């Protein structure tokens, strides 16, 4: 169509036929009105003398989401004054001029720049240059910068002496924004790529970009997971819709979730929910780009959820649609409350508010203020008393201000919650151990990663509310809880009111625990003025230390009540996590600080550091109380800081300059009680120089100084490689920074770092300790694990690494997880998930060179961007042929006997050797054979027989492969026999060690009795266990829901999805209640603690083998017996 | 207005590099392309190169690769260029260049000298 | 690339006499050639940016003429401030050429 019709060269200039070169150019940009770049050429292209000079609209876009318009009057527009006017390029909506060698030629605005809106219709007239008026909105996000030209030119114009003019339209673009928002609806499969980007041979093509612009792509089919997307105050999100799509009413035609307030209304637009939001590209049209945006304006501080559907072409056969539904979410700070999850503080009607951006315009000062809602509502509103709750996760620096009217004649004997808050600046701190426990559950979460809560999917506040409401009612973890009064059921003869609700809710406040803001967090400013200067108001302010030094995210509120006045109640949700734990600072003084980067020692004076943007500089001349140091109060030693305040005025030598004349509006902290440390956060600068800054201490009459080496590179460094050695910890390869994988700020030169370590290995107990999760929602969304080859054979291929593929490269090697059992009768172990350790056997067949990567750096995120650890690991030569029997044919390599189906073997052993057994393929292991094994057709324990202590046969008793040491004294002869059942009907796959159900069944079968065995003591150890490599049964309760979800079709023609969803449960049953079943003596105590309890037994396939069991006789059975003497 | 400023003359030993400095001077720096031409004494001249400031990409000659490198740099307004390993017959007048919208270079620098003897 | 075939290698003139350059090409071009003019020691200095057209400050005796295979360049009258070495380069494509150069002699 018109849209695109690009066939022709069309080599032009500037400057056309004119003669005027760029010096004399009259170059003044579009007017700038309400965010439109607007250069209308009215009167400016007639004919006129002193010409032609040639008129340049310079556009120049740095802002997302920008509107552009240019206007040429058309022939005819006035009597003689735009004859024979020319507009270059005939098709100037879409096709746009560009400049490559010395000329202008013709292309697609849409290639240039990708997600153009074009609008076709513009004041219901055509876009082009035909009707005068041109029209097209500009995407939110642009990778690179893009320069094109547009031309109106009047040369050829003329009246005797006058001749008109020459336009031109110069539209310049700069990279801005990052992504947007939402969903991209793709017409590809799902498809995981490699951790290396070298595979990237291809040229830049169109589908690469649209996979890099949405925070989250959804393919066209084994889709498991429907879109969510979130929304904030000032922030754009946008959706792109199938190519197939059918209808759409994820725009106006749109529905809200709240059932407490709602009037069964069909649908709503977001213009009408949200005032002065705007949506783009409402008709959907456009050469190629389906995609809609919206933005939020700033002052909104509502909180509200949405649901929307898209219906695609085709449907299925007939008339079943596989329509979508996607979530809307325009604003959930700190959703995860105990207003929420508590059902007796259901009933009284909240309005839950984010707090804003406060009106000094500073973007890190948030704001709420109860002024206007704590007023003594009309009496003639039957709803009754209200309750206002503002929700806002803080961060480094982030400064919190709440306002409230404590004025007599119209709020009289207000009070201020909690009671202490005035007077000892004490606040309600609260519990998280409910939050914890519902996430590990659901998104898998362990204790460990506390300070990064928050961080993980909204899901469980909406859509699937009544899932966690039920998990409390339901499981009985909760019912000792000292809160379970609150969450309780309520019933007919006892229910709850109004009035109830919120006596409940008074009663909550008085009984939670209450802990002085600043003794919690340290270096915290807190400032409270009982009344302002206007003798109305009642004012609490604070700034969030720069370093968080807690181990767990710090959750309290307070606030103001009005129930003795009959007014409102004020509620202010904040949480404050940790950010970065390492600050570059100079530390002159001898006490050590572990957060700070270099401590400098006494016998140096001076300390230099490199800084860049979001980075904070520390500078500690002063003592510090370590938790082994009894605190007092003592005066602040008479510490000479040149200047008085160090870093808000800073020495560039010897006069004193502030620092925002060096830095772009920089923030600085400080501490009202300690003259130091003082800090400042590097702000987005402009001054890209080497620039030099340095404050100075006088420590026992020694003057300190700190230089600090300020700089912008134009190119930032490309990569920073970290080498580490591991180290030997109890047998076991360990690795420091190995929790680097975890998110780290976005630090402008922490973008790009890579740690590497290296592993040797020439002894045997060869453990690998890797934490390496398996991916889940929230943290570990994008984990990959990928290994190479280096010797001998240098693979140019990544492959991914599993458990079979470390067995093509090391033949017998194992891939183990930790337990830490305390009593086999317990039906679930103590398993440590997160670390996977490998084994690998005695015969290291020669020089083993490889790398073991995850990239969990594919995991990005506003403020935080995930790690990236790789694993060099080099395997020393050993010929170490392990005694042993080769049942099958694929053991022959790994034993010098071809015991080939030779059922019954037996080797005579000697001290100073080593025996290593294995079943056959598919055979049940009848007994550990070093921890309990056969002797006389008795099942006894030769680890006290043999006096074995931490050998390998207490190591690799409970391993696919499992090897002995013959200890160097024995007291007499002994023999004991290692046993493999085979039954002849069925082959059966071993995943998990067999339960003692199983086994027990297979020793009443095989004739074998146990009644004198006594158990280990062995205390604070460790144990290797085999599972697959990631539980499978572990199931994920999000994917069934919504997949059960998905079976209902929640959205395709008003199908109400609120009722839908609320009739969505998970069946108990398929969870068998508490994991610490039975009696736990709890006295096993080390290190991490009470980890994760799973079930290893897999009860499914052992309850076929049982019954097998039975049913079979002897006849069938085959036994495969390693029989060995010890003399 | 508008002028061209380029650095003095410099000799360097064969195998090292050399670098050019040219500043553009009024008018406008990022949407114009700036050439550059050398000359041996007694010859006709030969074109190397050009860049436009706002995009990093620079496109050299056919004929030379590597050796020839032509960057900008908008913060200072200059177009350096950078040869490296350098030969025998490299001793040339080394001139830059500007277009001004004429799709032609309008305007050209004071020039360059440089030996490469050893 | 495009060659530069300009001719003549070198002109002999006194003041007051026409002088008439040439710059051929190796194939057909529409246009977009220039002439540079360049004494021992001077910059190369455009005097014709286009087919025809001039320069600003740039003498009326100049006049260019010529497309496609052939061009020329003709010079009315020859001043004491018009006599250089001569250059001819075409932009059609990117990499640009220069040709051999045409001398201007002083009297004969």
């Known amino acids: 169509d018109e849209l695109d019709k690009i066939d022709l060269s069309y080599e032009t200039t500037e400057s056309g036929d004119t003669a005027v070169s760029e010096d004399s150019y009259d170059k003044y940009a579009s007017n700038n009105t309400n965010k439109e770049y607007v250069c209308d050429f009215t009167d400016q292209l007639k004919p006129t003398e002193s010409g032609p000079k040639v008129k340049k609209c310079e556009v120049k876009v740095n802002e997302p989401l920008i509107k552009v318009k240019i206007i040429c009057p058309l022939k005819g527009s006035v009597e003689k004054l735009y004859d024979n006017i020319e507009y270059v390029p005939k098709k100037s909506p879409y096709v746009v001029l560009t400049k490559e060698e010395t000329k202008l030629k013709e292309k697609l605005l849409s290639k240039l720049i990708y997600g153009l809106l074009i609008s076709p219709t513009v004041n219901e007239k055509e876009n082009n240059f035909k009707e005068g008026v041109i029209e097209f909105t500009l995407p939110p996000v642009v990778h690179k910068a893009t320069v094109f030209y547009f031309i109106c030119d009047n040369s050829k114009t003329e009246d005797d002496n006058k001749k008109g003019n020459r336009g031109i339209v110069e539209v310049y673009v700069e990279p801005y924004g990052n992504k947007i928002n939402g969903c991209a609806f793709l017409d590809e499969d799902e498809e995981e790529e490699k951790y290396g980007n070298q595979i990237e041979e291809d040229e830049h093509n169109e589908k690469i970009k649209m996979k890099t612009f949405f925070t989250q792509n959804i393919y066209k089919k084994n889709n498991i997971y429907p879109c969510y997307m979130k929304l904030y105050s000032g922030d754009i999100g946008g959706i792109l819709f199938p190519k197939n799509i059918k209808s759409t009413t994820c725009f106006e035609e749109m529905i809200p979730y709240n059932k407490e307030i709602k009037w069964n209304k069909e649908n709503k637009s977001l213009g009408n929910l949200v005032n002065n939001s705007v949506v783009y590209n409402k008709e959907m049209n456009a050469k190629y780009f389906n995609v809609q945006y919206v933005h939020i304006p700033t002052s909104y501080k509502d909180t509200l959820n949405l649901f929307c559907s898209i219906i695609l072409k085709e449907e299925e056969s007939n008339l079943i649609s596989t329509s979508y539904l996607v979530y809307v979410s325009i604003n959930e700070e700190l959703n995860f409350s105990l207003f929420d999850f508590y059902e007796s503080f259901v009933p009284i009607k909240k309005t839950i508010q984010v707090a804003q951006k406060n009106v000094n315009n500073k973007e890190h000062d948030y704001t709420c203020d109860f002024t206007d809602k704590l007023d003594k509502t009309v009496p003639s509103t039957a709803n009754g008393k209200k309750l206002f709750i503002c929700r806002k996760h803080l961060k480094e620096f982030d400064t919190f201000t709440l306002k409230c009217n404590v004025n007599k004649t119209q709020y009289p004997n207000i009070e201020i919650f909690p009671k202490t808050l005035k007077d000892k600046k004490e606040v309600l701190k609260l519990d998280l151990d409910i939050q914890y426990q519902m996430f590990s559950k659901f998104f898998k979460f362990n204790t460990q990663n506390a300070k990064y809560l928050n961080l993980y999917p909204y899901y469980l506040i909406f859509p699937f509310n009544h899932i966690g409401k039920k998990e409390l009612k339901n499981n009985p973890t909760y019912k000792n809880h000292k809160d379970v009064k609150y969450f309780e059921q309520s019933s007919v003869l006892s229910p709850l009111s109004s009035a109830d609700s919120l006596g409940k809710l008074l009663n909550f406040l008085d009984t939670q625990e209450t802990v002085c803001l600043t003794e919690k967090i340290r270096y915290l400013n807190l400032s409270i003025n009982e009344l302002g200067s206007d003798n109305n108001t009642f004012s609490v302010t604070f700034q969030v230390p720069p370093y968080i030094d807690i181990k767990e995210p710090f959750y309290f509120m307070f606030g103001c009540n009005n129930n003795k006045g009959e007014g409102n109640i004020g509620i202010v949700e904040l949480l404050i996590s940790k950010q970065e734990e390492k600050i570059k600072g100079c530390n002159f003084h001898e006490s050590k600080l572990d957060y700070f980067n270099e401590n400098i020692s006494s016998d140096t004076h001076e300390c230099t550091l490199h800084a860049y943007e979001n980075d904070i500089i520390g500078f500690n001349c002063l003592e510090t109380t370590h938790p082994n140091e009894v605190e007092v109060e003592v005066e602040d030693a008479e510490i000479y800081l040149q200047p008085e305040n160090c870093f808000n005025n800073v020495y560039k030598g010897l006069n004193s300059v502030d620092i925002t004349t060096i830095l772009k509006n920089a923030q600085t902290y400080n501490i009202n009680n300690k003259k130091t440390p003082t800090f400042l956060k590097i702000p987005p600068y402009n001054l890209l120089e080497d620039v030099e800054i340095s404050c100075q201490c006088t420590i026992k009459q020694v003057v300190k100084k700190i230089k600090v080496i300020i700089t912008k590179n134009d190119t930032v460094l490309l990569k920073r490689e970290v080498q580490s050695e591991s180290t030997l910890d109890d047998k076991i390869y360990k690795c420091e920074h190995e929790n680097f994988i975890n998110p780290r700020v976005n630090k402008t030169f922490d973008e790009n770092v890579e740690y590497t370590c290296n592993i040797k290995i020439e002894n045997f107990f060869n453990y690998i300790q890797i934490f390496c999760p398996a991916k889940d929602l929230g943290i570990y969304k994008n984990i990959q694990m990928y290994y190479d080859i280096v010797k001998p054979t240098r693979v140019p291929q990544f492959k991914k690494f599993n458990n079979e593929e470390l067995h093509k490269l090391i033949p017998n090697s194992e891939m183990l997880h930790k337990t830490k059992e305390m009593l086999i009768l317990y039906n679930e172990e103590k398993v440590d998930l997160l670390h996977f350790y490998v084994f690998l056997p005695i015969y290291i067949k020669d020089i083993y060179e490889f790398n073991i990567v995850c990239d969990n750096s594919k995991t990005m995120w506003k403020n935080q961007l995930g790690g990236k650890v790789i694993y060099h690991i080099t395997v020393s030569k050993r010929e170490q042929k392990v005694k042993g029997c080769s049942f099958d044919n694929e053991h022959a390599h790994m034993f010098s006997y071809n015991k080939t189906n030779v059922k019954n073997c037996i080797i005579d052993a000697k001290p100073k050797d080593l025996i290593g057994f294995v079943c056959p393929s598919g055979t049940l292991k009848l007994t550990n054979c070093f921890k309990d094994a056969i002797v006389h057709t008795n099942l006894t324990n030769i680890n006290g027989i043999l006096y074995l202590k931490n050998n390998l046969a207490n190591f690799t008793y409970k391993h696919q492969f499992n090897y002995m040491e013959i200890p160097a004294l024995m007291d007499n002869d002994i023999s004991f026999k290692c046993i493999c059942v085979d039954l002849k009907k069925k082959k059966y796959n071993v995943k998990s060690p067999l339960g003692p159900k199983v086994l027990r069944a297979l020793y009443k079968k095989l004739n074998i009795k146990f009644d004198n065995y006594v158990t280990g003591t062995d205390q604070n150890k460790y144990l290797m266990t085999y599972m697959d490599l990631h539980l499978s049964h572990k199931r994920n309760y999000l994917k069934e829901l919504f997949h059960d979800l998905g079976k209902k079709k929640p959205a395709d023609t008003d199908a109400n999805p609120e009722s839908i969803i609320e009739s969505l449960s998970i069946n108990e049953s398929n969870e068998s209640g508490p994991f610490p079943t039975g009696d736990v003596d709890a006295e096993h105590l080390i290190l991490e603690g009470y980890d994760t309890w799973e079930s290893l037994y897999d009860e499914q396939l052992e309850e076929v083998i049982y019954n097998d069991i039975e049913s079979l006789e002897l006849k069938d059975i085959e036994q495969y017996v390693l029989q060995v003497n010890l003399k | 207005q508008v002028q061209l400023v380029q650095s003095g003359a410099e000799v360097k030993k064969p195998g090292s590099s050399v670098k050019v400095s040219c500043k553009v001077s009024?008018?406008?720096?990022?949407?114009?392309?700036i050439i550059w031409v050398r000359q041996a004494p007694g010859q006709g001249l030969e074109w190397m190169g050009a860049?436009?400031?706002?995009?990093?990409?620079?496109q050299y000659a056919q004929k030379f690769q590597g050796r020839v490198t032509i960057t900008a740099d908008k913060s200072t307004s200059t177009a350096y260029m950078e040869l490296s390993s350098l030969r025998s017959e490299d001793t040339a007048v080394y001139y830059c260049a500007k277009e001004s919208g004429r799709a032609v270079a309008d305007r050209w620098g004071q020039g360059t000298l440089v030996t490469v003897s050893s | 690339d495009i060659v530069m075939t300009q001719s003549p290698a070198s002109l002999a003139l006194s003041l007051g006499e026409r002088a008439t350059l040439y710059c051929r090409a190796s194939?057909?071009?529409?246009?977009?050639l220039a002439w540079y003019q360049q004494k021992p020691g001077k910059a190369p200095k455009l005097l014709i940016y286009k087919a025809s057209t001039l320069e600003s400050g740039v003498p009326s005796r100049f006049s260019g003429s010529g497309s496609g295979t052939e061009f020329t360049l003709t010079i009315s009258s020859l001043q004491p401030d018009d006599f250089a070495t001569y250059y001819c380069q075409q932009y059609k494509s990117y990499p640009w050429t220069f040709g051999q150069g045409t001398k201007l002699e002083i009297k004969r």
């Open positions: 860049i436009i400031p706002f995009q990093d990409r620079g």
């Open positions: 194939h057909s071009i529409s246009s977009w």
């Open positions: 009024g008018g406008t720096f990022n949407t114009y392309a």
